Every structure is written in structure tokens, then in C-alpha cells.
Amino acid sequence: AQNITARIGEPLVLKCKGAPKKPPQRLEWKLNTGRTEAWKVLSPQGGGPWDSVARVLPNGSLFLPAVGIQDEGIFRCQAMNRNGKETKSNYRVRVYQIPGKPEIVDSASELTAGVPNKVGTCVSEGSYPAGTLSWHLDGKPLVPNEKGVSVKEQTRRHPETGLFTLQSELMVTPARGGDPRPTFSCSFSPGLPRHRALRTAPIQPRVWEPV
Amino acid sequence: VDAQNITARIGEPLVLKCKGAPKKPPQRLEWKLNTGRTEAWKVLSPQGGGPWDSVARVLPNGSLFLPAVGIQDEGIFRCQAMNRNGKETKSNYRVRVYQIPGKPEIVDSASELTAGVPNKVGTCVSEGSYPAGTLSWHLDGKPLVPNEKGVSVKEQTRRHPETGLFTLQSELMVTPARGGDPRPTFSCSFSPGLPRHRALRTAPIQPRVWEPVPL
DNA sequence: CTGCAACGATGCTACGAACGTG
DNA sequence: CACGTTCGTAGCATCGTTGCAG
């Protein structure tokens, strides 16, 4: 199966392989997507609510005016050149939606060495698939469980759209003697490596001194 | 024109981009196109709703969509969208199309022809070509130019009134120079307007050149 | 059995959109 | 607010493969 990808809201056109470009042709589009109760077979004329979702073109190609999470699925076209010539096209469909730029909330202006502080919560909105969130300090990324470094993360799918919202709250115990003017950022690393990662603006709180 | 050029094969779907438009509805944009089907200027909307919904329908993402092209679809296509706000963007498209005829055929081809005089060598025929395109003769693989040394071509173009397509015929006759190649090779080559594609050649003919009985 | 042709697949380049900077 | 740079996306071209005919 040939792997495929496109942006939600975008049109989609699947080429039927080995099939007459002009009608009438003998061919079958059978697919299973989030819009299907089972394998669904759409005909040359097609019919039903499916004409508003995915339709067969006079040239034998299947088409979707707007693709959505609901459409991730399997698409197979078994077609008849003339008779009995037969070739079968096979596609595997992943989709995606680029979320709004990441934001740190509840970020710290000041913080104190030797113990934990709330650095902030990096928050992404409107992503599919969900993807990952990471943090970095002055150019380099950070890992939990190492030298008092932890994370409280979560993911939530907006009911209407089906997209995702990821929260990541950063917390660290600053070494005493370190960088008093440190810069932190968060980055959204998408599930499908379609685009490069997106990074929040930095935060440069001031490390202060206990007694 | 500010119009960019687009060229498509007949029968295939085309999709035109609306520059700087909302990717999801609701969107404000309206297409304008004067072509074969449009009486003058047809304006199309994201809602569509006319008889054009089975022909030209604006997609949810703003682009213009044609299920399969046809000759009548040749013309200019423009869009006006508003990037909110109030940013506003344009598109100018010239769209032409084409069809490719079957491999040209030869007919009425001389069994053998004789020198020192004109001869009916035959006729090339190409059907289903668009735009019209042309038929060029080649002797041995080298061009044959009319008006020059007994070389003549009786030519026509017949447009199928229904398919709006072209049936082509080119009849070549030649006066061979006495004492020429006794087994010369003719071919015929159809060519279209742009490098929209390559050239199609007819299976050659290798007639026998017989000399005139002495007087 | 061999050659030629057509179709499909991949790679490349150019055009447009976005993002950041001054 | 504008200009300029970069990423992303889309189209054209190239090459290889498979099919078909001689």
C-alpha cells in the first residue's frame, strides 16, 4: 500500500491505475475509513451521502474535496482495463493538522536555586495527530528523572474537531552556582515529520539565592 | 495579461488555487471566468448551487474544482479573496487544453510509382487530436518541403462536429528525379502546438521506384 | 525470443506562503 | 509597517519498469 498524507480541509484525488480515462469503465473503489461502517464500495455513478465526501470522477479517479480525521483509512481500486485486464491500486492514508504555535503559561520571572520551581506550562492547540512536546535550556533539550528534573504532561482532544491540546508543565531544581540568566523554551515536535518543530519564545527568569 | 498559463489534457480534472484565501470556510472569494461554456462572465461562489456544481464547484478550501475538462472549458479564470483583514489577493489564469489523436495511418499508398513525373504516394490520417496539429512528410527520415521539386501535399482538417475534435488528412505526391533512389522511404509525422507532447510517426512505406520505358 | 511503447515511479526545480527582522 | 529569508508545496522532467507486438 502506498502511504499518503495531506492537510485537513484540502482536496484529495486518488488515481485509479490501469483504467480507461474516459467513461464508461468497469472499476470498483472499495475502502474503509472513519466514515465507513464497513468496507464501502463506491461505483462509477456512485451515490448516497458519499457524493459530499468522496466521489468518483469521469476519469476513474476518486476525489475528496475536504479530507478530515474521519477519512483516515484504506483505499483500494480494483479496475478493469478493458477485458479482462486488471490492475489494483492500493493506498494507506494518514492525515494531519498543524496546531497553533506553542505557549508557555505560568512561567517564572524569578526562581530560587537548590530546590524546585514552576518554570511554566507549554501549551499547544489544534493538532492532529497529537504529537510531542519538549523543553530545552539555552539551546539543549531536557530529560526527566535526571538530577531533579520532572514533567506533568497531558493531551486533550477537542470534541467538535477531534484535534488535540497538549499541556507540558516544566519543573527543575537549579544547581547552586549555575546560570542566573538561563533561557528556556518548549517545542512542538509533530507526529508526522511533515514540518520542522515549533518552539515557544524563551523565558529568562532570574535565579535568586536562599539562605 | 497578468494571467499565468495553464495547459491540461482533455478529460482530466483540474484544480485552481485561490491565492491567499482562508483554508477552511467560511471564506469570502468569488471566481470569474469567461470561456466556451460561459456566455460572458460567470461568477462562482463557495456555496455554488447552480448547474455548475457538476461542472465547476469551489472547494471548502477555496480552490476551484473541475471534475473533468472539456474543450468548452478553455478560457481565463480569476479569483478574488479577502485575507482577513482586509488583505486582498488576486489570481489570473489562462487555460488551454489538448487531446492526442491515435497514431497516424497511411492510405491510398502507391504499390510502386514511376520517375520523371508526379505520383500519388498516399495519404496520412490522424483522428482525435487537439488542438488541430499537423502532418509532416519525411523521405528517408528527412523533411519533405512543398513547392520544391515535384513534391506536393493535398491537405485538409475535418472537425468532428460532435467531439469538436480533428480528423487529419495529408496526401503526398512526388516527381522523382530520373535515376533516383529505387527504394526510397516515406513517413508521416503528426505534431501538436506546444511541447505539450512529442511527435507520432506512421509506419513507413518502402515503395519500389521503377524507371520509365525508353522511347 | 527480441524490440518497441506506454505507464508508473522518482527526482528536481520553481512558485508561492509563511515567519522573522529591521 | 515593509522587506527579506526560509519552508513548504506544486509542476515538469527524467528514468525505469512492465506490457505488448513482431
CB of A199 within 7 Å of some strand D atom = no
User: Quick one: cell of B70?
Assistant: 472539456
CB atoms within 10 A of CB A97: 18
- The closest of B179, B180, B120, B192 to B151, measured between CA atoms, is B120
Q: How was this structure determined?
A: X-ray
Q: Are A66 and B59 in contact (CB under 8 A)?
A: yes
Q: Measured in whole angstroms, how far is the alpha carbon of residue A38 from the centre of its chain?
A: 25
Fold classification of B1-100 (topology level) = Immunoglobulin-like (2.60.40)
Nearest to B63 among A11, A21, A63 (CB): A11
Largest CA distance in chain A: 88
Using alpha carbons, list the distances in angstroms from residue A208 to A24, B57, B175.
78, 63, 105
* Contact call for B24 and A9, based on CB within 8 A: yes
Give chain B's length.
215
The domain spans of chain B are 1-100, 101-215
User: Quick one: cell of A175?
Assistant: 544547581
List A29's β-bridge partners, or say none.
A42, A77
CA pair distance B187, B204, nearest whole angstrom: 5
In which order are the strands placed within the sheet that holds B166-173?
A: B105-107, B120-129, B166-173, B152-159
Q: Distance from A55 to chain B by nearest Cα, in Å?
A: 10
Residue A106, classified by CB atoms within 10 Å of its CB into exposed (0-12), middle (13-18) or buried (19+), is: exposed
Using alpha carbons, list the distances in angstroms from residue A77 to A42, A46, B114.
10, 14, 58
Residue whose cell numbers read 523521405: B139
Bases of chain D with protein Cβ within 7 A: 7-9, 12-13, 20
Instruction: Measure CA to C1' and name the residue nearest C6.
Output: A18
- Report whether the peptide linkage leading into residue B26 is cis, meaning its omega lies within 30 degrees of zero: yes
User: Quick one: cell of B13?
Assistant: 480534472
Residue whose cell numbers read 529505387: B182
Give the resolution to one decimal, in Å.
Answer: 3.1
User: Tell me, what DSSP letter sits at residue B160?
Assistant: -
User: Tell me, what DSSP letter sits at residue B162?
Assistant: T
Strands (E), chain A: 2-7, 12-14, 26-33, 40-42, 55-56, 62-64, 73-80, 86-96, 100-105, 110-112, 117-127, 132-137, 140-141, 149-157, 164-172, 184-189, 198-199, 206-208
- The closest of A104, A103, A118 to A171, measured between CA atoms, is A118
Using alpha carbons, list the distances in angstroms from residue A194 to A33, A37, A199, B7, B119.
22, 30, 15, 30, 67
Question: Please, what CATH class does the domain formed by B101-215 belong to?
Answer: mainly beta
CB of A18 within 7 Å of some strand C atom = yes
Using alpha carbons, list the distances in angstroms from residue A195 to A5, A97, A149, A191, B164.
12, 11, 28, 10, 46
CB of A195 within 7 Å of some strand D atom = yes
List B125's β-bridge partners, or say none.
B105, B169
Q: Is B182 helix (H, G, I), strand (E, B) or coil?
A: coil
Give chain A's length.
211
Nearest to B61 among A9, A58, A59 (CB): A9
Residue whose cell numbers read 474535496: A65
Q: Is A153 helix (H, G, I), strand (E, B) or coil?
A: strand
DSSP string, B50-96: SGGGGT-EE-TTS-EEESS--GGG-EEEEEEEE-SSS-EEEEEEEEE
Q: Among all residues of chain B, which has the CA nearest to that of A22?
A: B11
Q: Is A174 helix (H, G, I), strand (E, B) or coil?
A: coil
User: Tell me, what DSSP letter sits at residue B114?
Assistant: E
Mutate to test the interface with B, among A7, A15, A57, A67 (most CBs of B within 10 A): A57
CA pair distance B96, B6, nearest whole angstrom: 6
CB of B94 within 7 Å of some strand C atom = no
CA pair distance A33, A62, nearest whole angstrom: 14
Question: Please, what CATH class does the domain formed by A99-211 belong to?
Answer: mainly beta
CA pair distance B114, A7, nearest whole angstrom: 69
Largest CA distance in chain B: 93
CB of B20 within 7 Å of some strand C atom = yes
Chain B environment of A9 (Cβ under 8 Å): 23-24, 60-61
CB of B161 within 7 Å of some strand D atom = no
Instruction: Measure CA to C1' and name the residue nearest C7.
Output: A18
User: Tell me, what DSSP letter sits at residue A69?
Assistant: G
Measured CA to C1', the nucleotide nearest A101 is: C19
CB atoms within 10 A of CB A107: 20
Residue whose cell numbers read 508526379: B118
Q: 3-state SS string over A23-67?
A: CCCEEEEEEEECCCCCCEEECCCCCCHHHHCCEECCCCCEEECCC
Looking at domain A1-98, does it have CATH number 1.10.1370.30?
no
Same CATH topology for B1-100 and B101-215: the answer is yes
Question: Pairing mode, if any, of strands A164-172 and A117-127?
Answer: antiparallel
Nearest to B23 among A9, A57, A63 (CB): A9
* Contact call for B12 and A21, based on CB within 8 A: yes
User: Quick one: cell of A14?
Assistant: 486518488
- Report whether the peptide linkage leading into residue A84 is cis, meaning its omega lies within 30 degrees of zero: yes
Nearest to B13 among A9, A22, A59 (CB): A59
CB of B37 within 7 Å of some strand C atom = no
Using alpha carbons, list the distances in angstroms from residue B48 to A10, B45, B55, B83.
18, 5, 10, 20
Residue B54, classified by CB atoms within 10 Å of its CB into exposed (0-12), middle (13-18) or buried (19+), is: exposed
CA pair distance A13, B160, nearest whole angstrom: 31
CB atoms within 10 A of CB A121: 19
